């Protein structure tokens, strides 16, 4: 009946909290989408602005602008759910079943008109959000696509990573778009750097986070942040951004540009699935977990 496992927390430009969730146990294995105009009233279901029930669990989601929400479904579908004119409803635009297994990762491209999905079917697809079709289908990997992260400013560049131990730098301008960026353990999470469009960070299943420059695939700086897998990495909105890394070790850390630890939060009792920094207060960081918690952190800056 209800979805206890919170999968995604996403703050839009004004400061309204987005909430993706799934029931990964019990009689029903369905999912839900929630909007909270009052972030402190989360995850209380009756203290929300809008909500919707989905037929399958929410593995991933992204803000397609300020009204739209792109969803990676267990059913093998990419879904677009847009807020109504009043922002008190969430309605389906498309539910496209083009992937043959759990869609687990999603990222909207720079123009906001294209997006890239990464499924357990090993494929990577590029979508036209307006045309509601798959522009290109890519079987470049050998195992499950763990993470797909679209470039901040380039609409044809993005990073993907997989259980086949590869990190592919994509640029759809080339006839062979993918390119392996080496340097170990399996890549689990990708985060593009906001200022250096040629720098990015990635987390492996051994709790280690590594700082990687596309240019030279050598000298690369890294640190052991967590004890278990690194499920996510999100950079702060600051001009000089802080990196928040979440993990299966039920902890959250905030690190500087030299990877030193500035914050550590053990408030979570289950897996930490998402982190979103406040558009209003840049030292306020929100983390949803599998324990149904929403925990609002005050990062010491």
């Amino acid at each position: 009946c209800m979805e206890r496992q919170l999968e995604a927390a996403r703050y839009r430009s004004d400061g309204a909290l987005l909430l993706g969730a799934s029931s990964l146990s019990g009689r029903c294995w369905a999912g839900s989408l929630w909007l909270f105009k009052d972030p402190c009233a989360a995850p209380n279901e009756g203290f929300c602005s809008a909500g919707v029930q989905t037929e399958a669990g929410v593995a991933d989601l992204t803000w397609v602008g300020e009204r739209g929400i792109l969803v990676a479904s267990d059913s093998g579908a990419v879904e677009l759910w847009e807020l109504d004119e009043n922002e008190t409803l969430i309605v389906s635009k498309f539910c496209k079943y083009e992937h043959d297994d759990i869609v687990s990762t999603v990222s909207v491209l720079s123009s906001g008109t294209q997006a890239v999905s990464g499924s357990k079917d090993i494929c990577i697809k590029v979508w036209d959000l307006a045309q509601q079709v798959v522009l290109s289908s890519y079987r470049a990997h050998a195992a499950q696509v763990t993470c797909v992260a679209a470039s901040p400013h380039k609409d044809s560049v993005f990073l993907s990573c997989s259980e086949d131990n590869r990190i592919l730098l994509w640029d759809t301008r080339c006839p062979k778009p993918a390119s392996q960026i080496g340097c170990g353990y399996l890549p689990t999470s990708l985060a593009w750097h906001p200022q250096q469009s040629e720098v990015f960070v990635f987390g492996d299943e051994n709790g280690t986070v590594s700082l990687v420059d596309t240019k030279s695939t050598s000298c690369v700086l890294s640190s052991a942040v967590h004890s278990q897998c690194v499920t996510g990495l999100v950079f702060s909105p600051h001009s000089v951004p802080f990196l928040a890394s979440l993990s299966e070790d039920c902890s959250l850390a905030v690190l500087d540009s030299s990877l030193s630890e500035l914050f550590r939060s053990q408030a979570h009792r289950d897996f930490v699935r998402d982190a979103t920094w406040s558009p209003l207060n840049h030292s306020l960081l929100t983390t949803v977990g599998w324990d149904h918690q929403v925990v609002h952190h005050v990062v010491p800056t």
Binding site: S22, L24, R27, A30, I102, K120
Partner: protein, 621 residues
Amino acid sequence: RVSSGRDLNCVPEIADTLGAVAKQGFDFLCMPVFHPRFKREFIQEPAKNRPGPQTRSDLLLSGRDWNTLIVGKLSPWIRPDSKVEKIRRNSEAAMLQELNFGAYLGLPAFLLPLNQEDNTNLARVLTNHIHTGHHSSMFWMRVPLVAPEDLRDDIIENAPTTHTEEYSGEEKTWMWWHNFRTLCDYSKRIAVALEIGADLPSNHVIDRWLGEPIKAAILPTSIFLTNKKGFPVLSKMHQRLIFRLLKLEVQFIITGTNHHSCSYLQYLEYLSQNRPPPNAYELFAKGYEDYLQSPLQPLMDNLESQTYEVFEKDPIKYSQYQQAIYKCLLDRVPEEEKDTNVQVLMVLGAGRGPLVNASLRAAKQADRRIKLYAVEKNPNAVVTLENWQFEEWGSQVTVVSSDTREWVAPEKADIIVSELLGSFADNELSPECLDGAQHFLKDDGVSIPGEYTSFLAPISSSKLYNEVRACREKDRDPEAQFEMPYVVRLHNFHQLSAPQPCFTFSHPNRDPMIDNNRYCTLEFPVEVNTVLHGFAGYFETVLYQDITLSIRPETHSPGMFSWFPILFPIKQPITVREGQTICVRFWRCSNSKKVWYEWAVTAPVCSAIHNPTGRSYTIGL
């Protein structure tokens, strides 16, 4: 007409999902017993103490549904061979937990993937579950014809797909299965769920799965082409493979999302309906496929009435015997002597009299006179012969109740006719018998058959190897089942080399120091990489001149049922590389009481000598 199932990775409501699947036409659903993404922790706090239920309840379905309709699926995050110590430890506990939950439910099958070269700890944890408690479920190893790493799109700029042939490299998924089942000690509860891709591999890659325990064949929706009308269809190469799997009676599984306006199931049913109809041999053997039987010993034992009934209902073999006598009667008696010469015709091992009735029809069409004798040692069959001698044959046939080697005949014979052959020709001791009948044969008399030859071909079949392994009995040598031939309608197997002649006997043998013992060395060129488990034996016989009978597959006498191939197993299976020669040695041995075979492989590796001194198997004289 086709047992088919639906593979799912998303089941939000169990009975809703099953009802939709059943409406589609699927006889079963393969689904996860725990939520695919619900990763669990067993070692460290606080995720170790995760409250609430761990999966949906068993109450949601009747015990019957859980026993016949649900096929479990191992969670994709469970990786017992991960290079991360914590992931191995965690996936060990999670794997036993999932396997035990499927046993709790009485699931008829459970799926486990083979997607990497090393599955050593996966095998150890499955082997440990197999040895714990009471379950009996089948384990299905989902392994592809082509590894995903070798079928990827050539789109990685600095890591291109190779465009050269890698013979052994293309058969890598077979070795993933071979190592896995060797590690699990060839468990009868471990079978293959073979995954077919969009583009089929080379034939040799496909042929690596011959003789393998394939219980399911997985067809993903993306392998289906679209026709003019818009429905999913398959390439003519994919259809040939489906026809091969229909012979093995595998369970077809449809996986992945829908990309066509069940249509996939309808196509399978359509293909199944249009397969070539089963011939007389194919309909007779329906049920006997890969079933191990003891070879008959009609000399040592007395054949049951129904055994003779079955041997009689072989029109082809008797029509061939009719003509062999028909051509001999013309050759021995010229038309001028048509009523001056009556030929002494002696059947040796007459049974209930089917050769006696062939000799009557052969005397009518050849228009010659014959004096028939029906020699039979089985006193029970002799009751059948004497009731027919009185009621129908009359003075024509003289029924003699004796063993051909101890019978003192009234007068010498013109033709001796016998059916003393087994699936390996001389394995029923025909040489010994007809030898002891040469004294009562005229100095120019004909023997029908006049010659017979045994043949052998090396085979691969881990299924027949496992079937022989299951023949271990108490109060005997624990490996005696590997040192005796079996009569078997070989079906799930692979013939590694063309049959070659082994031992030949000719009758009469007017040479002294005759000796029926033999020693033959065969050299079998092998063109594929494989695993040898034994040798199929067949035979050929010359009844008279061009009239012949054969069970050698290439020259098989059409529509003949009296014989199925023999199988001579070997204790330890032998790896054979492409280009290697399998060398086999065979011996026919004897003392005054028994006759037996002994055999050994001398190349590419030696085996022990099988059945030394008939310690495991003899044929009584």
